[model samples]
Target: XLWQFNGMIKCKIPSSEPLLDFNNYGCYCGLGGSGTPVDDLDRCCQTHDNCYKQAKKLDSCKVLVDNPYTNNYSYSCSNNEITCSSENNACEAFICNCDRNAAICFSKVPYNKEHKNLDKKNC
Candidate 1:
């Protein structure tokens, strides 16, 4: 099945299982817009200035930050914030806020059947 919303397309599988796809997903980069069908997650992040994926695992999700920084050290997430440990074990933290107009970041899942399958397989 497919859904049209604000010039975007939302696709879903009509089986007992839950699965979906985004033919034209929305993204925010100080504004709202749509992206291509496949890999909408990646495209959405790319559409923004400070959003990206920080892990390979499906549940790892996406990250949004105030500014682009190097992940050259170990990091952890708690309470919607990411804490990174430097060489001296000193920690720096950043907030992952999904709200518009905030210095925040987040890791999120894409609306797609492939990602859903990957998530199930990994979990």
Candidate 2:
């Protein structure tokens, strides 16, 4: 016998560049809950854990875990390139490039209107 359930977990960086391309979106329970149903559900939660692991490995990234019911996890770049906060607490920042002229591979911003135009040689 098999039980079927559907669930999805997603994480996105509002401003920083795409960090990981490893199928970070979609449902993990499409196989009719094979093995144990709870275990299958637990796998869904592991997505966030994997995300935290990847984020921590980046020198310019910081991962913060907060409340469980809402947008509880986030990543931010060091050198003040972006700001990520939870209530009154700011997420820890990591320094990927210490040199002043180092290329900024990632940054957080309100909008990418100007940045996208610049990237396409239209600016």
Candidate 3:
């Protein structure tokens, strides 16, 4: 879905499943906006400056320097704030570095799915 705020477009997939062939979905074209649907999690990270590089690197999740400092990294999604952490268990942390340029991450899945299938998958 698309929302307009301050002349900029913000897109979201309200459904947990990604929009099929979302890049060619034509919402941006019809709306006269400058954007494209993000299909892959890595591709989504690339939409912003330096984030793709940071996110692709090992130990990308850092501790934010605030009181009760957050043990998470801030990701850039247009103008949105999304946090990722490496310390928590797979279910909560969701993503982890596997090597220098690889990661294992989880995308939110519905509750009805079997628990055995909840293991992290590649991104």
Candidate 4:
């Protein structure tokens, strides 16, 4: 038997580019350096032990701001490109939760104005 619980819905970066696409935006999540999640993940591994303990911890993790970049690109907690964790390492991993009842869940599917264009939906 499975129990179902109502949870809050949230939108993460619509595209993985926001997380690991620094060239276009900046390092946000995954493993990699610069715009690549691979390198970013390496840095997080060398930076934190807890981040290493749980691989999934870095699954959806994102950097508040990119290195050598101004604070203008800094991410806010409320933004879809950012998330919070108990450790607060800034590079810690996280999960994207989309609540079934949130308006955002129904706002747009697959197509978004900010990231992906709505016309590209059927593409």
Candidate 5:
């Protein structure tokens, strides 16, 4: 369901608005973020992080362990976006969409900060 949306929203750089912190500001995007999001793109990473959580609960999303694929994969919408499989369409689409959306969202905004936060929240 999440993958259906592709580059739909025009991202805003450096969002100052209040954002969600289900993990006490520890739940950040990518691999590094303070606690509060720096921009819409950062928010996208947080959203993607949460998406992976849900997908894992539902089924097998099969993301690598403790690895966010730094500078290797394209993470591009039309290219090496997070790959999904496991014969479970629900899980596959759910997980793939998370990466897909994040890739697209990150592309829209400007690169000012490098996010790499890893705190808690595992189920």
Candidate 6:
């Protein structure tokens, strides 16, 4: 859903599951946010969350650090982050790195659909 903080200056947490959405608890090991992870795979996503976290959190409750404005932010990968491969947008690259790393973790986790399915809870 779209949350306009104070009119135009807003926060739009992607809200189209299967298309676009963002939350605090990712489904199993992929998609959504990570409030409190459910397992190893989920934990991987949690770490990924930190990867995307703004250097200064509170001041930028903002990025979750990925919103409002971050076009010039220096994007780099760290920890288990693998290559996002050919990308131009720095922030996009940063996000791609996070997804790749988490995806790698998903590969090892032997996905559990029943367990992975957070229903709507992940949203």
Q: lDDT for each of the candidates? A: 0.27, 0.26, 0.25, 0.26, 0.43, 0.42
Query: What ranges in model 4 sit over 4 Å off?
Result: 1-16, 22-42, 48-76, 79-123
Candidate 1, superposed: residue stretches over 4 Å from native: 1-24, 27-72, 88-103, 106-123
Of 4 and 5, the candidate ranking higher by TM-score: 5
Kindly provide the TM-score of model 5 when superposed on the true structure, using C-alpha atoms.
Answer: 0.45
15-99 per-residue lDDT for model 5 (tens digits)? 3322222123334643434456655655766777776666655523344322222211222222324433444344445545565
Give the per-residue lDDT digits (tens) of candidate 4, residues 1-123: 000101112233343332223122113222232323223332232332232333333323324422211111122345543333345343321221211112132223232233221122222
List clash counts for every candidate, in order.
8, 0, 0, 16, 7, 5
TM-score of 6: 0.41
Model 4: weakest 10-residue lDDT segment is 1-10
Q: Say which candidate scores most in lDDT.
A: 5
For candidate 3, what is the total of clashing residue pairs?
0
RMSD of each predicted structure: 14.8, 16.9, 15.7, 15.1, 10.4, 10.5
Better of 2 and 6 by lDDT: 6
* True lDDT of residue 24, candidate 6: 30
TM-score of each: 0.21, 0.22, 0.20, 0.16, 0.45, 0.41
Worst 10-residue lDDT window, candidate 5 = 66-75
Clashing pairs in 1: 61-107, 62-106, 62-107, 62-108, 63-106, 64-105, 64-106, 96-105
Candidate 6: worst 10 consecutive residues by lDDT? 4-13
Q: Residue 59 of candidate 6: its Cα lDDT?
A: 42
Q: What residue runs in model 2 are displaced by over 4 Å at the alpha carbon? A: 1-38, 62-123
Compute the lDDT for candidate 6: 0.42
After superposing all C-alphas onto the true structure, candidate 5 shows an RMSD in angstroms of: 10.4
The TM-score of predicted model 4 comes to 0.16
In the range 33-95, model 1's lDDT, one tens digit per residue, is: 334313545344343333322221223222322222332233333544443334322111221
